[PDB]
Design a protein around this ligand. Structure first.
Ligand SMILES: Nc1ncnc2c1ncn2[C@@H]1O[C@H](COP(=O)(O)OP(=O)(O)O)[C@@H](O)[C@H]1O
Ligand SMILES: Nc1ncnc2c1ncn2[C@@H]1O[C@H](COP(=O)(O)OP(=O)(O)O)[C@@H](O)[C@H]1O
Ligand SMILES: [Mg+2]
Ligand SMILES: [Mg+2]
Ligand SMILES: [Zn+2]
Ligand SMILES: [Zn+2]
Ligand SMILES: [Zn+2]
Ligand SMILES: [Zn+2]
Lengths: 381, 384, 384, 384
């Protein structure tokens, strides 16, 4: 059947389009294909609804998945480019999602990630301190894994033992030993982490801590003399500090044993070809933004769209990073029971920028637009 | 199995008939199969008493009801093929038998428009401003038949866009939406709320919707979906917005987990609204009206009570106007769950912050003349 | 099968090579064996991936460990004869099981204090602390810094038929006749606190606890100190002065921190230059003066770097030595504790007194030609 | 069974010897049986290593210890026939064995006089006035070896009269009283705290005494005995007087049941008292002393610390002075358990009512010069 040609075309054009996700959704009256491009969905196709069972069925064949059951979700992988395949039992048919993991495009360069020079310096200084904790925070898809893999990429050596427990493992690294864990058999982050301490590790990587049990082991791994990398899901960088205390972690451990906390979120890049100045009133800029020391200097760009953009006005993505090293003063505020507003107050006062401030500086450089700054970052104060 | 074709024959006859209501209830002396047309009920069938147990058990199979317990009431719903059909079944143990009542459900004529749902303007501001975040979870609480599903569809219809992946899991789906991913689950095959969530997280959802969380297994990974960077919509049956926090804590969810995850709790209940034509002013002692209310605005209240007409069938009301309590989660409320909390003290905090509770909502609808004091006192507990 | 010979070869070459740790790690493409030698990892092997499942599998047999599960971590001990015994940790890596073997050398325990690189002046203080009838002496540093070597040597230093000495370790890394050693297991309900509570009921003279992780053990241990017992323990901190502040941050009141502790030491390890190939390296005096040394005698310094040789397998370094700061408490430091001084102030006075920093211990060791300049800069942190 | 006659031979030799302390502890290389005479310890025996497990297990049979767990510490006591003898046993798991320590118990020289026990005059008023009612229950809380049994004997010796039936159940009986009915229970035969109470209620007791209530089964019928019209005396191991109420509520006892039944909770702990001859004034910053104390009376404190002599064996203390917190149950406290309660809020209420807590008690004994700041900080948590 021609159906073979179509399934490959959907996967081939998704790679051509640099989409990070593929969606095949049947509906009652409709059938649609969506590509997610720079975190945003666009519908690239309308294949005929007669074929809905044929198009999905072969993708399960490629995944070595059972075609016989349409009533239940199924999961798997496909290597061709390689994709994580997720199947779901919608009322009107099965919806298939293919989420690509691109091995070659992973940057693995920190200067290339949009880190500001000062922020990069704190992060680099933080990761090479032995016996410390690095927390990378943000929502899903904010670049935590990309940032963290670059950190693991920056230090890898024959001289050190690096051990990682991830759920799932996003990419295979030579030289770094990765554990994939699934809870149904009893492997949790804590159990894998306790196993790590008996292996004589140097560097320890754990994807996230949702639990006090895992949190306590990981903070104990920091004080033992190993560098431990992890993530947390939070509204801002400071709030991870107060959330650790809410996890039940004693203040002295939070202050003493963790070197750094970062927060990052992702905004789309303005197109290099189509960008043109937009005139945004300085008072809208100042109302959330910098006071008008910089106001005359700001030039804000937006793309009109072109063939390069597929008429979106945006091509690519850039990080907005807030990097908070743990200051002696931050340690004192933790030890004193300080609240979140005061912790951010001193952090800004002491010269480490916020996410809105870092994003807003990227706007002055012309990398991102103003509408993206307001869409992504949360208003400060 | 002629009783099977005859069991369906009763429902099809009730389709041809105008009756909205059907009753099979068994007796030892006789067997009553009844239809209610235009509110009056009539006996239809005197079918076999030997197949009475067989038929009643069969209709229980249609509803996903457990036959293993005949001693306790069981409620549910069914779908029938038509060119669609849906019924809601209510089963009660009888001394001589098991009664089964089927009440029609009309899924049409109910729209999504969020302006007409009756949210108070300040309340709609909180609900609408809460339902757009990249981060959060929303909970709509009330009894079955409170219009919770309609309120969430209104939020969904406003949230639905071609730029996002919005998926829903409910059992059944009340309405069919074009473009929203809907998974209807029946637990016999192993489709479950929890299983639906674990399937959602691998699909890259922008927005997850699941109808209610009845337990921890669903609540744990639902809250995890909220902290992941997604938006979560659900319902619970509880007394209030703060009562929702208490039940969440009793399920075993950690206190920081609740205060971090959900940015909204909104409870509502439907109440009969007085007739347009039959409403007449009814004087009430203002002190009693005051007792429920602000004494300053007390004398300005005139509450209307309907008498009856051919439109309302002498009920003295017409439609349904809901009373809403919407509780965004404030930093103040956030600090109270984390420093330790009590249902009453959370009620006090939200109520001093300017968040209006159900009773005061029904009162404003009382002053406006939409409802009556009788109905407000029925559907709402006294705050003080 | 050759697997037997190959496994023994991996282990026997580890003993000849004086490695601290053995790693057999499978990957997707390559396969590797690593030895840790003098705190630094070097890969000595590339066995074929066909034997990878066999190589791990036989080691499990040697450990009396279950072959049936390849999906879970396993731990155990192995004793073999040429006799050597060391532990095993197995982990389920994506492409296979990685096995780590960490050598515990039975007859190689140092047992001598001067042999560890203690400063002549520092050693007197350490001995003075451990021979007092009451109070606690704390030795701090990261993992692998030799705290266990120092503590076992201290218990070795004073042991007598006249005293009952009791130690709680997790795990015990060596068995000594005359000292009664219990290996602690937390899963069975035995913690440091629970083990310590029994110790106070056993009528000890001197008590050893591996580390204090929290207040619960800290309070019990400090109360044992004031009882008339000498208690040996460790804490994880950056240096000796900060250990005082770590106790206070745990919630111990200042008066007990001053009164109940005799001394605090911190120590770390730097690699030792080759006996054969060592040669002078030229370090500019201004770079060394700004950090390494105050601007007196700096011109005289002779800095070494090894060229590498067959003795070192061209690493330039053979063996390692400790850098020690040993700080008994003078009344002036005790007075600052009682006055609420911060860490810098205690560090200022600790430095102002006879007490040498960790950099100072390394820099004196560099002048003797024992260690290089790169090692002194790599391990200890600059004091100001 | 020659090891049995030899096991007793060790204890009898320790009787002929002056040693207060015996240690069997096993080793793999050797076997150490040690006695401690005049505080110095000496190795006595090098008995068979083959019977080491046999002997150690046998001494565990003497103590009512469970042999089924060798992996965890077990503590207890034994009696020996002499013309009486009693020992307290402490068992600890060892890597190579199980250590057993026996420490002598001298039951003589401790009298009942209630004036010399050291209850503060206002505290003794509450305790003595509480221990006579026809209705109530008394609870004396503290750690093992706090003199709880001695305090209750003092109350008993004052309560004992020929006009009343006073019965006691404890395991073992510390002292033998003439005229008091004493039942010593060992749970193997089925004598139990609960069984002893059900036997008491049928005997028409005026006063019931039972040593501690470890569970609900005893607590339920103990409280019932208090409401019956009788007087109940017991102990618990807890942190404080209010902490006792919290544990009682956690056992499942209803809140009205606690507030109705117990009219007293008194916690105490023994602390070393400074030497008479060796006490010298030791100046302490009054602000720190103040921090623990009333700032008005702060400058008037002079606290004494002992140095050493031949009498105290250079310990710097001599005797034991207990710190007492006695908490009669006030109507104010009564209303707080019934309206809902918190450990901290009960502490606040009793402390504003004029009831003095442990810390302030130790401070008055500090100002009087009986004890020292070091000891007070060891045995008492800071109230504020
Ligand atoms: N600085 C950057 N420049 C370009 N692309 C980026 C940058 N940071 C992140 N991305 C893109 O965003 C995605 C981040 O996803 P990922 O980090 O895996 O999510 P998570 O961190 O939640 O696991 C990646 O696919 C990557 O291509
Ligand atoms: N002064 C020293 N000289 C030689 N080797 C040492 C010295 N200190 C530590 N080591 C090495 O360190 C290892 C033990 O480290 P350990 O004392 O267990 O550190 P930790 O107390 O952090 O666990 C031993 O194998 C020993 O070879
Ligand atoms: Mg990830
Ligand atoms: Mg150790
Ligand atoms: Zn363009
Ligand atoms: Zn009407
Ligand atoms: Zn060499
Ligand atoms: Zn003395």
């Amino acid at each position: 059947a021609p159906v073979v040609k179509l399934v490959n075309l959907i996967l081939t054009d998704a790679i051509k389009r640099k989409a990070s996700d593929i969606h095949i959704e049947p509906y009652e009256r409709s059938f649609r294909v969506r590509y997610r491009i720079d975190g945003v969905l666009y519908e690239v196709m309308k294949p005929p609804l007669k074929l809905k069972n044929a198009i999905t069925s072969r993708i399960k064949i490629m995944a070595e998945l059972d075609i016989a059951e349409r009533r239940l979700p199924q999961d798997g992988r496909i290597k061709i480019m390689d994709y994580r395949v997720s199947v779901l039992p919608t009322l009107f048919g099965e919806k298939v999602v293919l989420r690509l993991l691109d091995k070659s495009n992973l940057q693995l360069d920190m200067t290339k990630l949009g880190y500001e020079p000062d922020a990069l310096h704190y992060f680099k200084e933080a990761i090479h301190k032995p016996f410390g904790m690095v927390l990378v925070t943000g929502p899903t898809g904010s670049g935590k894994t990309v940032s963290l893999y670059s950190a693991l990429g920056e230090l890898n050596k024959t001289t050190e033992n690096i051990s990682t427990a991830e759920d799932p493992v996003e990419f295979n690294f030579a030289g770094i030993n990765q554990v994939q864990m699934h809870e149904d058999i009893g492997l949790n982050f804590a159990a894998a982490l306790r196993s790590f301490l008996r292996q004589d590790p140097d560097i320890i990587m754990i994807g996230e801590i949702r639990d006090f049990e895992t949190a306590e082991i990981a903070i104990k791994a920091a004080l033992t003399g190993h560098l431990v990398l992890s993530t947390l899901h939070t509204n801002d960088a400071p709030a991870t500090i107060n959330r650790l205390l809410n996890m039940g972690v004693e203040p002295f451990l939070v202050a003493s044993a963790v070197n750094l906390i970062t927060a990052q979120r992702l905004a789309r890049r303005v197109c290099s070809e189509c960008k043109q100045p937009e005139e945004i009133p300085i008072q809208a800029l100042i109302d959330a933004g910098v006071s008008p020391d910089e106001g005359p200097s700001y030039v804000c760009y937006k793309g009109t769209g072109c063939v390069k953009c597929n008429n979106t006005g945006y091509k690519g993505r850039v990080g907005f990073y807030q990097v908070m090293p743990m200051l002696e003063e931050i340690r004192e505020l933790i030890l004193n029971g300080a609240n979140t507003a005061e912790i951010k107050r001193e952090s800004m006062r002491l010269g480490i920028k916020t996410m809105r401030q870092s994003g807003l500086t990227k706007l002055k450089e012309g990398v991102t637009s103003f509408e993206e700054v307001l869409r992504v970052t949360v208003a400060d104060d």
